[PDB]
Design a protein around this nucleic acid. Structure first.
Ligand SMILES: NCCC[C@H](N)CC(=O)NCCC[C@H](N)CC(=O)NCCC[C@H](N)CC(=O)N[C@@H]1[C@H](O)[C@@H](OC(N)=O)[C@@H](CO)O[C@H]1NC1=N[C@@H]2C(=O)NC[C@@H](O)[C@H]2N1
Lengths: 144, 63, 200, 117
RNA sequence: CUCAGUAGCGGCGAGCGAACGGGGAUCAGCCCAUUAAGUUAUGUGUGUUUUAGUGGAACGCUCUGGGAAGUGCGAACGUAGAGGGUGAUAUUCCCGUACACGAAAGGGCACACAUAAUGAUGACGAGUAGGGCGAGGCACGUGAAACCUUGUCUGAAUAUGGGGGGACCAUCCUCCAAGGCUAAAUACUCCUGACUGACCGAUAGUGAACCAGUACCGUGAGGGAAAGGCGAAAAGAACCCCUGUGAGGGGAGUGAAAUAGAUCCUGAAACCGCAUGCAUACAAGCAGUGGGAGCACCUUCGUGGUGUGACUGCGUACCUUUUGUAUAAUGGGUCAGCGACUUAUAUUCAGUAGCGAGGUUAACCGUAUAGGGGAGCCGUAGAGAAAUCGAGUCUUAAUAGGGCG
RNA sequence: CCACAAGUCGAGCAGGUACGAAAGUAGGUCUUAGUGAUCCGGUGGUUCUGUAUGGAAGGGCCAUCGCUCAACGGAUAAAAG
């Protein structure tokens, strides 16, 4: 035990890799699992993803819809349970960013009722849902 | 390198909690001859079929 | 944990650093990762594009009776390119910080269990002479050993340089391969406490 | 880690050629020909391990027929008589007795006739 | 490094693909006519390095052997147990290694001072900004197309002035074009020195280990090989014999070994001889297989071993491609050597290990697999095109119904 | 009913309505053919978006228009020997 020639990996951790075209006995000899002839048996034989043989594809017989919002990329969602990562009792955008629950380029945040908290927090300038606000006050905290 | 999204499919599909949603065809034009029931039932989103979900996943690896 | 030195004195060390159960799979992963990271990986071969010459078609496609050929440097031909030419590779693997620390703790605990770790209150030599260190190790009955100190004294380093199966390291420089390879590990109390603070 | 194939390939070819000993011409000298000859020999042996039982039973039946006809019976009548007499001696032993001990086979034929009566 | 294959561009196809912000490396500004930082030459001084070199520890006996470094026994050195050689495998036989010294003379670099030059024909920027036409560049294909460049035609205001903030206007914010110089972090290897390799070992590795870009081919540009090994030491065989004073061999001699004798270590296969044993000149075919007499040698004397195989049942090769091949369908004259599912990145699933409502760092720093580095990423919430709400949300006049949860 | 994309029948609820004294009937025509995806644009609305801010341009959503794309799941806007 504890020698360079008495160390082994756990059972099932390692496997031999598959080696094609090395005889009848291996079970993957000759064609190597590619079948007989056709396009897929050639080198680089697959067709492009989304190609269906020539008929109009699924992503082209359906219409485009919607537009992309720019402020949604800067809006951040915060679970209520994540408030425990904040050091101190003040919950603001700056302290959430310091605790790393909000990305540094976000300009506003929202707190949703997802988990549970015990400490009392003071919330400054962060939007709260109805249930999140109720939980914040029930934990002995307040908003501004 | 990084897998690249097929932007045409990205413009057609969006992800739901357990799948993908999409709009319905045959509502762009030639609408006068269509019955009211077809007009109001082809409106809105539906789900992508399970037979097409795999292709959608290969085409849109990040959504 | 309470362990006695050679001179019978009692030292108290944390169970976290020196008392964790042995996890052979984790230790094996970390040891093999260290050995893989020791590789240099410098080599290359020439493919059919790198081999000298071979630009032109050796003979016409039809009519000669030969098998068709496109270049004299084809990998089928003698003297042609290697089919899958190699390039220099990096053999380093990522090891999780916690996994590395856990493997080191397991190794230290197993050494303590197997009695290959020897604690000493003080380990120093008065001169950079090989024979003095050899006599000290012989009376400690640790002729083949890795010595771990809080700081490596120059005289100790010079005395240990020429001894086979003997090495000397700082407390912050131990590695899982060297902890296992040597027959015994002679560790001073100061080095043991520094290792305890590092927590394996 | 370049691997040279010479030693192992030579061993395999030499083993095939050693199993091909005694064959005519290229079948005992040339590897491509010798390898086909060894496989076909194995196939023939597999088939003939079944054919041997049939051939030897046919030989036993022929010898028993000769003995029965010397004793005044046919093979089918003798077999039927022995079955009716409850004798369960098999054809291999019956043919051995027919070939090497005429008196015992005469006694067996008499028992078969007595049971047929 | 990330943001992010996101925002966008695109016969809205195939594909192309940012920026803002954040984390790092490195950090530096100085001037436009009495003219700056800086840079380059030359000369002097100091420091450092480089081009020859010197010394450099410690082993004996015994056995096998042609030969000892190997066996057995017992010693010595180690700031030297890197490496190479020596008749087989050496810390102590040799060259070296650690370490300690060393330069008439010449070269490189750094710093300081001194003298030139240069920066510097340039003094706040007019045929300029802007505009019409045609093109090019921007991730951006004329698009709602801002911004940069200009071939052509034009053309301001000039600090109460002018440029930008993606058509455009107003308001705010921000900067000062039409004059310049500037180290580091970055890119590379024809070369020089030292060190290294889960790189090759003569069909490999450079085309080339060898008198190789040679022989050879072509008018020419150009193309382009094959070919390493006697022995520790030539001790490379004096002399005799056959033969043509040839080649070649038999003796002798050397050597541990000459079937190590010169294209000489080992000496495989295809292919070609000689010798011995058995079979074979009345019998029709993938050549074997299951039986089976006789003969020869060996012998543990047989219910044994080796070689051969009269006679006999059955029996149309292999691969590929095909509905289907003995097929008169394809491929192979034979042997030996080489010859085809890889590597990098991203992603998904399974197994396994750590940690666990959390998990994990990237670049980078780091006498460097450690330890630091939390930017970022994934998970923890969904609905809606979106604004918005949120265990709900969308649709709707509807709290009805219904869809996603 | 169906590979997908599509196609077909539908009781019942709410609002407004027509014809009936009323119970009621009516979401085109006895039924099964009379048809064309996506892209790109046009038009009418809209409590959505709007690249510093207020607007606007442009985009989104709802309704609707333009193919003998008839080789009728339609490879180009654009092609004979
Ligand atoms: N019982 C029967 C008795 C019969 C009776 N006797 C009569 C009979 O019948 N007799 C037969 C005679 C046999 C045969 N005909 C004789 C024969 O052939 N002589 C040949 C004589 C000339 C020969 N060609 C010369 C030759 O080649 N030199 C080589 C050559 O330059 C070179 O090699 C390569 N690579 O090219 C080099 C490699 O470096 O080595 C050289 N050489 C070296 N040697 C040295 C060494 O050892 N150390 C140091 C260094 O000096 C080494 N270099």
């Amino acid at each position: 035990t504890l020698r360079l020639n008495e160390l082994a990996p756990a059972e099932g951790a390692k496997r031999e890799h598959r080696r094609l075209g090395r005889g009848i006995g291996s079970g993957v000899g000759k064609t190597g699992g590619r079948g007989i002839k056709g396009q897929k048996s050639r080198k680089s034989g697959g067709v492009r993803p989304g190609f269906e043989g020539g008929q109009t594809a699924i992503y082209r017989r359906l219409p485009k819809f919607g537009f992309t919002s720019q402020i949604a990329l800067k809006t951040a969602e915060v679970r209520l349970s994540e408030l425990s990562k904040v050091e101190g009792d003040i919950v603001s955008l700056e302290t959430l960013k310091a605790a790393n629950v909000v990305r540094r380029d976000q300009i506003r945040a929202r707190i949703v009722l997802s988990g549970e908290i015990t400490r009392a927090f003071t919330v400054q300038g962060v939007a709260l849902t109805k249930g999140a606000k109720a939980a914040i006050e029930a934990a002995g905290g307040k908003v501004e | 390198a990084k897998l690249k999204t097929r932007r045409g499919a990205a413009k057609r599909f969006k992800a739901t909690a357990n799948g993908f949603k999409r709009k319905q065809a045959f509502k762009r034009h030639i609408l006068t001859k269509k019955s009211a029931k077809r007009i109001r039932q082809l409106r809105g989103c539906v789900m992508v079929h399970v037979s097409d979900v795999a292709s959608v996943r290969r085409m849109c690896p990040y959504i | 944990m309470n362990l006695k030195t050679v001179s019978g004195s009692a030292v108290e060390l944390s169970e976290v650093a020196f008392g964790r159960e042995f996890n052979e799979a984790l230790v094996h992963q970390v040891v093999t990762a260290y050995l893989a990271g020791g590789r240099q990986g410098t080599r290359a071969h020439k493919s059919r594009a790198d081999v000298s010459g071979g630009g032109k078609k050796p003979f016409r496609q039809k009519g000669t009776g030969r098998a068709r050929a496109g270049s004299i440097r084809s990998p089928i031909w003698v003297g042609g390119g290697k089919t899958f030419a190699a390039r220099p590779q990096d053999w380093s693997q990522k090891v999780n910080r916690k996994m590395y620390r856990g493997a080191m703790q397991c190794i230290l605990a197993e050494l303590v269990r197997q009695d290959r770790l020897v604690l000493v209150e003080e380990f120093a030599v008065a001169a950079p002479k090989t024979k003095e260190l050899l006599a000290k190790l012989n009376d400690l009955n640790a002729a083949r050993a890795l010595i771990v100190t809080d700081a490596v004294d120059e005289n100790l380093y010079l005395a240990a340089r020429n001894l086979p199966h003997v090495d000397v390291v700082d407390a912050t420089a131990i590695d899982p391969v060297s902890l296992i390879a040597f027959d015994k590990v002679v560790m001073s109390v100061a080095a043991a406490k520094k290792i305890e603070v590092e927590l394996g | 880690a370049r691997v040279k194939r010479g030693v192992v390939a030579h061993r395999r070819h030499k083993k095939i050629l050693a199993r091909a000993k005694g064959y005519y011409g290229a079948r005992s000298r040339v590897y491509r020909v010798a390898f086909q000859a060894v496989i076909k020999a194995g196939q023939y042996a597999y088939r003939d391990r079944r054919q041997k039982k049939r051939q030897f039973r046919a030989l036993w039946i022929a010898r028993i027929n000769a003995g029965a006809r010397q004793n005044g019976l046919s093979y089918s009548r003798m077999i039927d008589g022995l079955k009716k007499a409850q004798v369960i001696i098999d054809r291999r032993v019956l043919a051995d007795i027919a070939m090497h001990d005429a008196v015992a086979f005469a006694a067996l034929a008499e028992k078969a006739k007595g049971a047929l009566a």
